[PDB]
Amino acid sequence: GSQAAHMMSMDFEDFPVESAHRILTPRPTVMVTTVDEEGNINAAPFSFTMPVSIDPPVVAFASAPDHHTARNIESTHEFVINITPADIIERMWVTARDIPAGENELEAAGLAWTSSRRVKPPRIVEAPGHLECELLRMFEVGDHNLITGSVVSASVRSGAVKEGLLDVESVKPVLHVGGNKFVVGDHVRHVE
Amino acid sequence: GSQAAHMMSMDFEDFPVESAHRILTPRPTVMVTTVDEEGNINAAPFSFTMPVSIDPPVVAFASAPDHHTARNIESTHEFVINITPADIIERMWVTARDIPAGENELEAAGLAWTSSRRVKPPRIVEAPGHLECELLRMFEVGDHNLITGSVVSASVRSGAVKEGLLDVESVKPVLHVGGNKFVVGDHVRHVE
Ligand SMILES: Cc1cc2nc3c(=O)[nH]c(=O)nc-3n(C[C@H](O)[C@H](O)[C@H](O)COP(=O)(O)O)c2cc1C
Ligand SMILES: Cc1cc2nc3c(=O)[nH]c(=O)nc-3n(C[C@H](O)[C@H](O)[C@H](O)COP(=O)(O)O)c2cc1C
Ligand code: NI
Ligand code: NI
Ligand code: NI
Ligand code: NI
């Protein structure tokens, strides 16, 4: 092997495969909003998320199949991904509490919501960026449901975009490390 | 609507749906290694990635179908996800150059690799965390291929784990904002 490879031959440790998600971090933490058939708003944070296709715009996120978010999407086929700025990190955290079905956790979080342009579920006012999505497919994978969706509409808060990109320095997106540990992503470093 | 919703009724702007991935940021940037049938090592960075299932461990990442990474997985059905620490950000960036097929971009990047425990493709020495994966499914989605994989093995560098989580403070994982802009995720903030 290469000399570098040779001297590190002992620097590695086996790590539990069921803790794999803890190595693939930090991850963007988003609040996903949905509605049930009665129109009740539901909101919850998710950190297993990622874009999939640029054009057509298709995004994805993984949810436990039992979550209100999972079940609402299965029945109303829509959801809005809301970016989480650090200024409301404690509030998004509250939206994770196990609030009764049909109840809007945005209320208990002291967050506000406004209508979306193309879908039923709302956009969170405090969120600087929103991705209005239409269900594509809900593939079941292990203990989660891989949910992909077509982005039919996108909106941003004034000043949240810098040169076409999310103005992280301003927005300071919340990233999940694991448990109650997070990373505020306001550290811009260009490669050039 | 709520008073908060009312005063923000004009604070939002429509945003191109084909720029949706730019709102869902910053994202973990990983170098995925694979091999072709001849055993040639290939390495490339990806920022559309996310865990999917915790147990069984299933991870995912999106790649252009034409990439060497996509084609290698299709033929050898394996790949290793390698976390990118900020100390080699310029080097991982080089692995993105359009190096000829069959050529190992790790070499041109001045990076080293060592054998994996369960799969053919290698683990990058400079990477503090590795996820050895076996292809699960390569669902085509728009202009990308959603690739999921079973994590058959995981390994970390000594000191890269703090209380079961990726020691971001030490590792300083590289997060992609878009283009050549990144975020070093070494800003731990607990919610409590
Ligand atoms: C930062 C953070 C990230 C989370 N990410 C996920 C995730 O990716 N997938 C998931 O299934 N649950 C995730 N959760 C847990 C859910 O938010 C939680 O189970 C919530 O009660 C679900 O609400 P619902 O039943 O109204 O959908 C996360 C929680 C927090 C605090
Ligand atoms: C920070 C960063 C993130 C990237 N993320 C992705 C991604 O998620 N999906 C993708 O298809 N290409 C992505 N790319 C581009 C590929 O790395 C690039 O096309 C590379 O040449 C692919 O190599 P391959 O053909 O050897 O697989 C990214 C590049 C950089 C610098
Ligand atoms: Ni709920
Ligand atoms: Ni429908
Ligand atoms: Ni290549
Ligand atoms: Ni095979």
From Swiss-Prot, chains A, B:
Q: Name one GO molecular function term.
A: FMN binding
Pfam family example for this protein?
Flavin_Reduct
**Which domain of life does the protein's organism represent?**
Archaea
Name any cofactors this protein relies on.
FMN
Which keywords are on file for this protein?
A: Flavoprotein, FMN
Carries keyword Glycoprotein? no
Subunit info here reads: Homodimer.
- Report the sequence similarity comment from the record: Belongs to the flavoredoxin family.
This one is known as Protein MTH_152
Query: Which organism is this protein's natural source?
Result: Methanothermobacter thermautotrophicus (strain ATCC 29096 / DSM 1053 / JCM 10044 / NBRC 100330 / Delta H)
